[PDB]
Amino acid sequence: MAEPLLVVGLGNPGANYARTRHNLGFVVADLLAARLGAKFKAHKRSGAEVATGRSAGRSLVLAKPRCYMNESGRQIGPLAKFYSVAPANIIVIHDDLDLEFGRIRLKIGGGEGGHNGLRSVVAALGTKDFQRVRIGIGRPPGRKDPAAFVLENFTPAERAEVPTICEQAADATELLIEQGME
């Protein structure tokens, strides 16, 4: 409420992953930065790229790890400190295997739903009590390993809705920032 907020979109750096299921977080962070009219820059003290701005009269810090998914948490801890943000005010956006495609849910705490990015964060923060904006991608077909599923692009049908879904996730995040969780 004077407390700065750290919104983190998870994903993998590199053109080959920009469209994969596991990068929705990056996509949403990109939208939020655009809405804020703020751009990303390499942050010397973390390794992630950051952009800053205002939302709901709140001071905002948007970031996207430049490290691969498993090393996400190690870039977040340092950012939290640099801006002195508490875990509770850290908002992580991520794809979620346990939510049907396009289904968006908010939560603080809870499990990782088999998400490796989420685990490195818990591991790095020493706590599961940070905020999450869960964007459902549904379960993987039996013919596809879960880890491979999230690293592959959305199906033609799903692809047509992803942009819309991300707008909604961006909106949810803003709303969560406005009077979120409780």
- What are the extents of the domains in the chain? 1-182
Catalytic residues: 22
Distance, CA of 79 to CA of 123 (rounded, Å): 15
Edge-first strand listing for the sheet containing 104-108:
41-42, 49-55, 58-64, 5-9, 90-96, 131-136, 104-108
Residue with tokens 């996207």: 64
Closest alpha carbon to 21 in 33, 12, 31: 12
Closest alpha carbon to 59 in 9, 6, 107, 10: 6
Contact between 54 and 95 under an 8 Å Cβ cutoff? The reply is no
Structure tokens given for 76: 């977040």
User: What was the structure determination method?
Assistant: X-ray
Distance, CA of 149 to CA of 132 (rounded, Å): 21
The full DSSP string for the chain is --S-EEEEE----SGGGTTBGGGHHHHHHHHHHHHHT---EE-TTTSSEEEEEEETTEEEEEEE-SS-GGGHHHHHHHHHHHTT--GGGEEEEEEETTS-TT-EEEEESS--TT-HHHHHHHHHHT-S-SEEEEEE--PPPTTS-HHHHTTSBPPHHHHTTHHHHHHHHHHHHHHHHHH---
Phi, psi for residue 59 in degrees, rounded to 5: -80, 125
Burial of 119 (0-12, 13-18, 19+ CB in 10 A): middle
In words, the CATH class of domain 1-182 is: alpha beta
Distance, CA of 182 to CA of 175 (rounded, Å): 12
